[PDB]
Amino acid sequence: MPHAFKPGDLVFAKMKGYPHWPARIDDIADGAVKPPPNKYPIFFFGTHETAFLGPKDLFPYDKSKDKYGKPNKRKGFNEGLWEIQNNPHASYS
Known part of the structure; x- marks a missing residue:
């Protein structure tokens, strides 16, 4: 049975006005901006953008x-x- 989402999980992520997009759940680096409550940091492959x-x-x-x-x-x-x-x-930085 499925767990909750964790950093490293691979997904397609859906944003309004865009097709379902290859992405992963990221870690939050020490000292970095955290996401709001109940949100995950999503790294979009290809664009290398986060939401x-x-x-x-x-x-x-x-x-x-x-x-x-x-x-x-x-x-x-x-x-x-x-x-x-x-x-x-991989690191896409």
């Missing part, structure tokens, strides 16, 4: 890849697909 999102917008990668893991016109997406498949736990 704060709640579970309703987080779709586990394994279950969802057949549906959402298809190439897309949007900037950074295809790069994103490569990252989540090939090196999802």
